[PDB]
Amino acid sequence: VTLCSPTEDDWPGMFLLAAASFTDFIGPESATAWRTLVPTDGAVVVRDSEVVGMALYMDLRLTVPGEVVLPTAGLSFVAVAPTHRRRGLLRAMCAELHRRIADSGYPVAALHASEGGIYGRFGYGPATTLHELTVDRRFARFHADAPGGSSVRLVRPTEHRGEFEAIYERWRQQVPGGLLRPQVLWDELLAEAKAAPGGDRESFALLHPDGYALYRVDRTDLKLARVSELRAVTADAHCALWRALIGLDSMERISIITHPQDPLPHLLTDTRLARTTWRQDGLWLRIMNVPAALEARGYAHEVGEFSTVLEVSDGGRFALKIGDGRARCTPTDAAAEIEMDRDVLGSLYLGAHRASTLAAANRLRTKDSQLLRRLDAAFASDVPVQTAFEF
Amino acid sequence: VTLCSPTEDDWPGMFLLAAASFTDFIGPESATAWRTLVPTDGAVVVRDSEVVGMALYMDLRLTVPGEVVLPTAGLSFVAVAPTHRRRGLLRAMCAELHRRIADSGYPVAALHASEGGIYGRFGYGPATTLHELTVDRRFARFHADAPGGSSVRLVRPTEHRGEFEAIYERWRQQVPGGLLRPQVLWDELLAEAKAAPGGDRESFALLHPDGYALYRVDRTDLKLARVSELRAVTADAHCALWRALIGLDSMERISIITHPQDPLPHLLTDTRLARTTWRQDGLWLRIMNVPAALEARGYAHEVGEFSTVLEVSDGGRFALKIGDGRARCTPTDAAAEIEMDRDVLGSLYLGAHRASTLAAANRLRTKDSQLLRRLDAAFASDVPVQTAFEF
Amino acid sequence: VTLCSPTEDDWPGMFLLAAASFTDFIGPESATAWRTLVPTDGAVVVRDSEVVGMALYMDLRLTVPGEVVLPTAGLSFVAVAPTHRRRGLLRAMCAELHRRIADSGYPVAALHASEGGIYGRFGYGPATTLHELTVDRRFARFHADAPGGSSVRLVRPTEHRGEFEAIYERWRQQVPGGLLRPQVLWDELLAEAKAAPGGDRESFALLHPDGYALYRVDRTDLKLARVSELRAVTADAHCALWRALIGLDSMERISIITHPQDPLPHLLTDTRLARTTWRQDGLWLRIMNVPAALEARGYAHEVGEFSTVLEVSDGGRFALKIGDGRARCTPTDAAAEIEMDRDVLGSLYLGAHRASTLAAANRLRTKDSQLLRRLDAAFASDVPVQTAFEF
Amino acid sequence: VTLCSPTEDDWPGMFLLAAASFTDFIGPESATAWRTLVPTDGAVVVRDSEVVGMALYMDLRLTVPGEVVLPTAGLSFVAVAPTHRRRGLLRAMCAELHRRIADSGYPVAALHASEGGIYGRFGYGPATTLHELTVDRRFARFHADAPGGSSVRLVRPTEHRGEFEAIYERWRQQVPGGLLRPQVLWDELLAEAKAAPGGDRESFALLHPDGYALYRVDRTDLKLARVSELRAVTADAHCALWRALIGLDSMERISIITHPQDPLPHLLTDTRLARTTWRQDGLWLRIMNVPAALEARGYAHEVGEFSTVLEVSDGGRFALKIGDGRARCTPTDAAAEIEMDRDVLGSLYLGAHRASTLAAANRLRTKDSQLLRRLDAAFASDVPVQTAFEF
Amino acid sequence: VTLCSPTEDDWPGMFLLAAASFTDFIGPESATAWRTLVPTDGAVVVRDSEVVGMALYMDLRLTVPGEVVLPTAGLSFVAVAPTHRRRGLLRAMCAELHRRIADSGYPVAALHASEGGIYGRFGYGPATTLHELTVDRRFARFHADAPGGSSVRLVRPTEHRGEFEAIYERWRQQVPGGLLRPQVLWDELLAEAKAAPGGDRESFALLHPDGYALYRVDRTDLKLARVSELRAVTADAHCALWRALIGLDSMERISIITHPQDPLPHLLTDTRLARTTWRQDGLWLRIMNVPAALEARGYAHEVGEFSTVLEVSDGGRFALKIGDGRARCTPTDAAAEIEMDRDVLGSLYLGAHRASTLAAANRLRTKDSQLLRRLDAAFASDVPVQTAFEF
Ligand SMILES: N=C(N)N/N=C/c1ccc(Cl)cc1
Ligand SMILES: N=C(N)N/N=C/c1ccc(Cl)cc1
Ligand SMILES: N=C(N)N/N=C/c1ccc(Cl)cc1
Ligand SMILES: N=C(N)N/N=C/c1ccc(Cl)cc1
Ligand SMILES: N=C(N)N/N=C/c1ccc(Cl)cc1
């Protein structure tokens, strides 16, 4: 077996492995569109003749707390042939891509995990949380304080692409976890909005000046509407879109994959009607360069200036000073006051997990509880961390 | 219909209404034990001859952030006869008890809600969050950093009451949401630990010096262990108890009703194995006296001294100054900078809900986003808010 | 918002609202075929630019007891945008169409209800009952008295359209609830008989000289045959068709949506094998002109001549004389002996509901129990009321 | 009604009856391919004008113990119209085909039964056993003794037809129950390997020099892989293919329809992981000529030479001498020592059922238990009996 | 931790561990009855004070092919505390008991496995197969050849103990897998025949001179009868009991845990009605003394005298000569012709698994296929191997 960047001849072998590895495999036409986001030298294959392993990264733009946009390597299309398990192919492919990603100057890498047990050992920590809410809309009544209660319009998605793009572009710059969505991914999204024979039903859009929702009736449960995407840049837009969705009088239930701080439950007289039916890790982060990443993000202005020494396991030791919402992170050989594996740092980085929660599991070690409270407060995000789209 | 404090003659009528209203009705013997927590004048009934409505409160001790214990009126045993719906009996009973509770000098009242849509209009806000985790323990592997890995012992609950009481007493003083558990409730708890013919199976305990877990196999799902209660006063105890529970090799799944900040997922190599299968409002709070409650709790030392004017709808207007983890809350007629209904204040009070989340739903109105960030940070609890026991 | 008859430009907006409102939306091609049954001025839309509401009626021919055929306005394609709920659009559209229907000279209007709680307040009463029977055909044995036991032929529906049309035309003239089925609806029916990729399986027909049955295997339950339509003009045809359906030896169960008086159960040695698995209101009637409707239908010859005074709430007061199977219904200011809302009259009109049953619910008020027995007997239909097809 | 060989004009009527009788009806194009295996005079129809009944046989080659290949008449496409049940059409069609099959010189006939209760009375006995194994591959660990542990390759079925054909041809000559698979059935098999809109997903192949496996993800259960076919000519190939299938890391379960003696369970440390989820009769045999069939197959060399008298009910009486793995079977009027119906002989013939098991049900009568042990041992197959493909 | 034989003081600790380890724990009274089958020094415990591990064996009598009864050590009541997993307690307890069992002169040990993956590494091989048949008795029709068709009587189990004991005693001496059932186990069995509040329903018996069946209606499925035990010493008794069970006209289905060679399916016109709904390893055997065990059992008289050299991994090497249904097994240092682990020998020993099946998984290695056929034939049992009762 040998690991190398793939030639044009390798791509049919990669699509076969893809088709056999991913049940949601988007097919060669869609794969060729996503491929435009893969830089030169962004892919590796392992051949035995035939492709027995592959992995690549895409050039992405990730919003982190403080409305800072980082260049991000988005790992994807990772597969090992069922014939070549337990031969260290994944470890070999991840090592080679991480080397290329670091040499290319990316401060962070990111992925969506097919399983929860794989990516921790390669330095990836879960950094966003997916939260499915299911609303029994037959009982849903909006609170007297709820904004609104004719600003929203029912429209065909393909006829209002420009308006969706503009709303999304405002949303992603404003929200930690936001990703730039390139033209090819808008092409792919609005192609999925069409009904398929023996497949998904037709998608409809609810369009507001400052938000949109894309939804479709479930294939088999004809009383369930699934919201594929709701992007709202104001509270008024968010409420107005939910009033319109609760107006889907032929539906019994409306489902959406959102974030833990979604205010929908508080818009209703009965907060319990917005049931949490599913929770899962969303985006995973590997901090490639600790000082670059720590200095790039904004921090909470509320916590007072403090200094400490952070040691990342096989990742370096730093004098970390945080004050006025900014961090300075410099090399030191001074005694560490905080230790953690690289994956734990990825989990803290966007504000989704509390340092004190990770400390309680001993994933993060300090002998100073005041330092723990200060890390918690400083790494907290004012804007709740959200998940943009799966890649 | 007339509302009055119940005579000894009313109690058989109250037990009949109880039996018809609560499917989990604990029966007259248990009810008579709980009754010892109801003060003189703690109960109201509405008669038509027969009891058509009832409500009472118990004297409770609630731990709030800063390890401060408040006297708390715990509303319970609230029922209206199916024959007397929509005659304002609940509104009449809640008004009379709230008057008695306020005149008695309780700064807060609390309850567990049978439905989510009832108690908001009487000034109760959900203040704790129940989070059910289900672990597929056949795949569960503890992380290398996980504490431990013979400190825990498998024991009969009834033989180690004193040790459970001592651990719980340490736990409840330390944790916001903690309740003092009186002797009668320990009597009731250890009586539920026995197997019942056609009922629950036998309960077992896992006992550590600094924690315990009570669990039983599910009646019908014989591969499910349900943890009724896990109290751990150290991280070492929490991990050691979970190592023992993952050691229940005849079980496929272990379930527990915990809090959102439970560190269990981070103790495992695969965080996804600890699945969130259910979420619900736990304890509801009504702030009876805004200045007494706001001044009693501790606040985050991290946020800098700040002053504002809080107006509670039909609850008064206050100059609120927070600094050095303490609040001063005094009458003012100065212009309000923050407005909210009383229920919203109950929801912020223990740190379970963010002011900025409630603002996004317009349940909390200010024109200052800096003030919002300061409220969020100040009302945050360093110790995660937990739910003690249902009443 | 404005209500007006739709221009050709409005129809794409109407199809979008249709697609978003009706999960069974037949698509623009089918909708354009049904549209040929909508008279000039038969449709209304409410615009905000975009279509936020619509409703129309079709010209139909309804058979009522006595084999009398009434011109009937069939309301259909009624939708309000999820963005424009609770603004009285439905009430405004129903008022305008009812005005047009009454001015056009229709004695009755009719509809199929998407929900049971909407149409009562606009004067529509449920007038037919759908009764689903499921037969476990593996145990089905025909009684010795059962007619028959090679008159039926298994055929391709598209090759015997003329024979189906002729049988249906005889059936609909003979049966209360019968509707004339125009050529476009035969086009649509025999187009649904074809298998669809990821859709329904192929339909087969059982053809007798005096009856037919159309059936198909269920998409997902491959041991269930669903009879979409069985029309039999003689008892011999009905039995012969059921012998052939019980002969579907690869099926475990045969299902059909029929009427409560279907004799199938009595054709078998075990009447219990024909299980009632579902019941629902079928056709709803609004009597537009009380005297025209009451005088048009035939009445039971068995009841002796009787006279009374019927008052319809906001519908007039009439001297009603019934004798020799005919009614005379004339204006009066004499004291009412019977009162009911207009919807109740629609429910009595085809013989599906007993006056004494509606009296027991106080939907129909009289102080004379003899009058009640006479109404029951007179309004009864000798031919059981059936449902023709959904519109 | 009349029974006759079908003209070219009869075939559209036969396809209509097929479509109405077989939910898995392969359609006219596929039926026309299978039709190439039906000899002249291989089919009968019963007409009333229209086709109310049909049955045919195909020319097949069946491997029986001793690696002997018999010409075999494969009955198929048997249907009676639901309109013509209980008129003896099946009995009339089976009698006519059996006459033709016997006159043509076939020693055995065979079929796959749509139900278990039909074919016994026409002399067919179930002769192979289908055994579905479902493996929870997440727990599957191969035993230290298991062969292997990169010989298998993941490939597209349509690109390796020649290799599949060659492996199958070696397999079918070696295994009792093996059938020659003609070119048209390879055409049909590799056409089913393609994904269908609203139908089955894409098939993949695992290819070894001495075995192959064809599998696809289940349409609705996306964590289930179904192996449609695994053919292995060596133990090494069988183990290597199962290592590759257990490597389908995105699947929770792998299912296969195999035979009772499949060694898969013994390849794993936990034999229980290979769960038997389904069992059913596979191939049914009717021995057309008792002496020809008994003399054609090989017998166990282990049992010593023995002689007996076998009487088949309405099938003749024979002096049966078995020695050195060969039988001689000659006419006799000597007293019978063994009696059985013809169907019982079909059940013994390939070694799937023990004579002593059928004796215990009195399907096989002797007064000599030594004779029973000798029949059991002699009729046993060294190579386990398997099922080739459904027809 | 220390391993030692338990004192009377240890038994409450053992019952606590039992209650926490076995959901079907029979309780202290039943455990005390089973305890009478445990010899002096038959039990081991591991203490830390408290019991963290236990294992014992009972003195049993096992019937093996040739109607030979072996003294057998029945391992049971094996548990490790959930607090003491992965400390080698099981390995330590099994080593100590195996030493005692071997020194005591038992030629074999046996157990029922709670999981399939544990006992192979301690030399236990699965030796019997449990086969659940479920009959849809509404379609069940007995074949014309079926024996019988008033010999069976419906009776109360507790009134016919003597008759059950006598039938069972005849059965167990005759059948490989048979166990002597001592008086205490008859006490326990007929105590389980009584209905329990919130537990199993009442058991009934069907009694024949040469067989009995004990059955009860399922707790929750009231159309399912479960046969707990059917013992028949003649084919006539077996058929007569099944005629009576198919006569349970209020039941839809009859279920029984039987063996793979149960003739029930062949008693019916439709063999498919007896569905295999479950299969699992029953009794596991560890051959403690290879020569004693191999020489004790009878072998098939059909296979000719043959000699070979068997090597058991860490179990010795033997010259094995089999002829006239007897084996001689003597020490040798001659080259091995057959090798296998000890567990594989346990799996062959009662005739449930074929040597050629285990060879195909490479659990059994030889370079002689003739030797394999001879082992298969010789180790085969004329009487099908059955499972007596769980211990
Ligand atoms: N569609 C997704 N959820 N991820 N797809 C990512 C992808 C990236 C690169 C290639 Cl070449 C193909 C696919
Ligand atoms: N057992 C509970 N979950 N709540 N029970 C509270 C209660 C309080 C007072 C009386 Cl008199 C009876 C019951
Ligand atoms: N197919 C139905 N069940 N009802 N469809 C009625 C309809 C009537 C008019 C138009 Cl323009 C479109 C559809
Ligand atoms: N595809 C099958 N499982 N059996 N199909 C057999 C067949 C045989 C002859 C004709 Cl003409 C059509 C079909
Ligand atoms: N009831 C069973 N299935 N096995 N029980 C075996 C047992 C053996 C010894 C003791 Cl001390 C307790 C129980």
XYZ file of C-alpha atoms in Angstrom, chain B residues 86-364:
279
model
C -63.282 26.262 33.941
C -64.819 27.848 37.117
C -61.575 29.675 38.161
C -60.938 27.299 41.147
C -57.173 27.026 40.409
C -56.841 30.874 40.081
C -58.790 31.309 43.404
C -56.656 28.631 45.253
C -53.289 30.008 43.902
C -54.279 33.633 44.861
C -55.145 32.561 48.464
C -51.972 30.417 48.946
C -49.702 33.145 47.395
C -51.207 35.674 49.895
C -50.502 33.281 52.825
C -46.976 32.446 51.479
C -46.071 36.187 51.082
C -47.596 37.141 54.524
C -45.632 34.216 56.087
C -42.311 35.767 54.838
C -41.229 33.213 52.151
C -39.012 34.970 49.560
C -39.713 32.270 46.888
C -42.308 29.590 46.062
C -41.582 26.502 43.899
C -43.347 23.578 42.167
C -43.023 20.691 39.677
C -45.490 21.308 36.776
C -47.832 18.496 35.549
C -48.061 20.514 32.260
C -45.891 23.332 30.816
C -48.760 25.768 29.980
C -50.414 26.318 33.437
C -48.020 28.040 35.887
C -46.424 30.912 33.826
C -49.530 33.122 34.298
C -49.250 32.740 38.148
C -45.612 34.038 38.015
C -43.729 30.649 37.969
C -40.787 30.249 35.567
C -38.983 26.948 34.876
C -35.639 27.251 36.763
C -33.973 23.774 36.365
C -33.687 21.430 33.328
C -34.046 17.607 33.529
C -31.783 15.827 31.003
C -32.169 12.051 30.516
C -28.952 10.322 29.338
C -29.116 6.715 28.067
C -25.688 4.963 27.748
C -25.214 1.837 25.516
C -22.814 0.416 28.119
C -21.728 -2.486 25.804
C -19.669 0.089 23.779
C -18.764 2.354 26.777
C -14.955 2.745 27.258
C -13.553 5.245 29.836
C -11.036 7.878 28.560
C -7.351 7.567 29.664
C -7.773 10.906 31.582
C -10.916 9.570 33.411
C -10.330 9.470 37.219
C -9.886 5.996 38.822
C -9.384 2.771 36.798
C -12.157 -0.919 44.378
C -13.634 2.234 46.060
C -17.366 1.529 45.288
C -19.396 -1.232 47.048
C -22.647 -2.918 45.881
C -25.004 -2.743 48.916
C -28.660 -3.021 50.052
C -30.094 0.545 50.312
C -31.962 -0.071 53.653
C -28.636 -1.063 55.384
C -26.742 2.221 54.538
C -29.370 5.000 55.146
C -27.004 7.038 57.407
C -24.274 7.097 54.717
C -26.791 8.167 51.974
C -28.231 10.924 54.259
C -24.699 12.294 55.041
C -23.639 12.314 51.315
C -26.979 13.933 50.238
C -26.740 16.584 53.056
C -23.222 17.567 51.755
C -24.541 17.545 48.120
C -27.699 19.712 48.686
C -25.774 22.509 50.591
C -23.258 22.734 47.722
C -25.549 22.719 44.605
C -28.105 25.317 43.391
C -31.469 23.475 43.243
C -30.486 21.408 46.329
C -33.358 20.700 48.798
C -33.074 19.571 52.425
C -34.564 16.038 52.490
C -36.372 15.541 55.848
C -36.504 12.151 57.698
C -40.038 11.310 56.372
C -38.782 11.589 52.723
C -35.833 9.218 53.512
C -38.484 6.834 55.039
C -40.507 7.114 51.769
C -37.428 6.777 49.465
C -36.105 3.545 51.106
C -39.678 2.078 51.115
C -39.724 2.551 47.259
C -36.373 0.564 47.155
C -38.284 -2.721 47.869
C -39.676 -4.858 44.983
C -43.510 -4.831 44.572
C -45.664 -7.726 43.223
C -46.601 -6.661 39.641
C -44.568 -3.473 40.343
C -40.950 -2.170 40.274
C -38.034 -4.633 40.790
C -35.623 -4.484 43.798
C -33.287 -1.416 44.052
C -29.517 -1.785 44.654
C -27.043 0.898 45.787
C -23.463 1.642 44.693
C -21.797 3.311 47.721
C -18.600 5.428 47.666
C -17.255 7.534 50.602
C -18.205 10.735 48.590
C -21.193 9.526 46.481
C -23.984 6.965 45.973
C -26.154 5.681 43.095
C -29.565 3.946 43.536
C -30.653 1.865 40.522
C -33.121 -0.855 39.540
C -33.740 -2.988 36.429
C -36.749 -1.703 34.400
C -40.036 -3.676 35.026
C -40.537 -4.641 31.338
C -37.175 -3.816 29.600
C -34.884 -6.340 31.417
C -31.730 -4.982 29.602
C -32.327 -1.405 30.965
C -31.010 -0.259 34.390
C -32.623 2.994 35.621
C -30.556 5.113 38.049
C -33.245 6.759 40.287
C -30.608 8.950 42.038
C -26.837 9.594 41.775
C -25.356 12.070 44.336
C -21.571 12.715 44.084
C -19.732 15.403 46.084
C -16.345 14.869 44.254
C -15.401 14.196 40.568
C -13.571 11.008 41.736
C -16.848 9.684 43.307
C -18.864 10.539 40.125
C -16.379 8.658 37.846
C -16.016 5.675 40.275
C -19.847 5.304 40.446
C -20.097 5.398 36.578
C -17.287 2.761 36.234
C -19.384 0.511 38.561
C -22.631 1.233 36.564
C -20.878 0.511 33.197
C -19.827 -2.784 34.959
C -23.528 -3.966 34.972
C -22.573 -6.562 32.290
C -26.125 -8.105 32.107
C -27.515 -4.645 31.024
C -27.409 -3.212 27.454
C -28.362 0.356 28.526
C -28.117 2.531 31.696
C -30.553 5.514 31.965
C -30.425 8.487 34.408
C -32.392 11.772 34.749
C -29.520 14.283 35.300
C -28.680 17.950 34.423
C -27.338 19.416 31.120
C -23.768 19.896 32.528
C -23.345 16.218 33.661
C -19.683 15.382 32.780
C -20.431 11.646 32.055
C -20.135 12.022 28.225
C -16.559 13.455 28.639
C -15.553 10.436 30.844
C -15.888 8.184 27.728
C -13.759 7.836 24.540
C -17.066 8.159 22.552
C -19.079 11.147 24.015
C -21.968 10.173 21.651
C -22.668 6.929 23.650
C -24.253 9.138 26.383
C -27.430 9.930 24.330
C -29.886 12.665 25.412
C -33.214 10.751 25.150
C -35.411 13.316 27.048
C -35.443 16.956 28.279
C -37.991 18.792 30.415
C -38.420 21.726 32.828
C -37.678 20.507 36.402
C -38.236 22.946 39.299
C -40.365 26.108 38.693
C -39.780 29.265 40.826
C -42.078 32.180 41.718
C -40.062 35.065 43.249
C -42.472 36.276 46.003
C -40.209 39.175 47.145
C -37.916 40.552 44.381
C -35.468 42.558 46.590
C -35.109 39.772 49.253
C -34.451 37.092 46.545
C -32.078 39.227 44.385
C -30.012 40.297 47.461
C -29.939 36.743 48.987
C -28.162 34.912 46.088
C -24.444 35.279 45.229
C -23.381 36.619 41.791
C -20.364 35.984 39.509
C -17.218 37.778 40.844
C -15.926 37.987 37.210
C -18.367 40.744 35.975
C -17.409 44.321 37.027
C -19.641 46.404 39.340
C -22.696 47.655 37.346
C -26.029 49.370 38.187
C -29.365 49.250 36.341
C -33.137 49.676 36.901
C -35.203 46.454 36.778
C -39.017 46.670 36.505
C -40.967 43.431 37.203
C -44.497 43.548 35.627
C -46.886 44.105 38.625
C -43.853 43.296 40.865
C -42.179 46.699 41.452
C -39.268 48.748 40.054
C -35.746 48.478 41.607
C -32.310 50.090 41.434
C -30.156 46.926 41.091
C -26.409 47.256 41.815
C -24.227 44.098 41.456
C -20.521 44.061 42.470
C -18.064 41.682 44.253
C -20.599 38.812 43.871
C -23.347 40.677 45.874
C -26.483 42.637 44.786
C -28.238 45.623 46.420
C -31.871 46.018 45.205
C -33.762 49.192 46.383
C -37.080 50.911 45.437
C -36.857 53.535 42.640
C -39.176 55.517 40.345
C -36.207 56.094 37.921
C -36.808 55.022 34.254
C -36.594 51.179 33.829
C -33.600 49.887 31.751
C -34.818 46.185 31.964
C -38.444 44.925 32.037
C -39.724 41.334 32.444
C -42.717 39.408 33.881
C -42.173 37.792 37.324
C -41.973 34.249 35.729
C -38.905 35.314 33.619
C -37.093 36.375 36.825
C -37.728 32.868 38.319
C -36.202 31.345 35.103
C -32.984 33.508 35.445
C -32.702 33.125 39.221
C -30.735 29.801 39.563
C -28.653 30.316 36.340
C -30.449 27.689 34.106
C -31.581 30.192 31.381
C -29.533 33.048 29.830
C -30.959 36.606 29.944
C -29.837 36.972 26.247
C -31.915 33.847 25.286
C -35.058 35.259 27.009
C -34.360 38.704 25.397
C -34.264 37.026 21.928
C -37.877 35.811 22.653
C -38.776 39.345 23.929
C -39.662 37.889 27.432
C -37.024 40.360 28.765
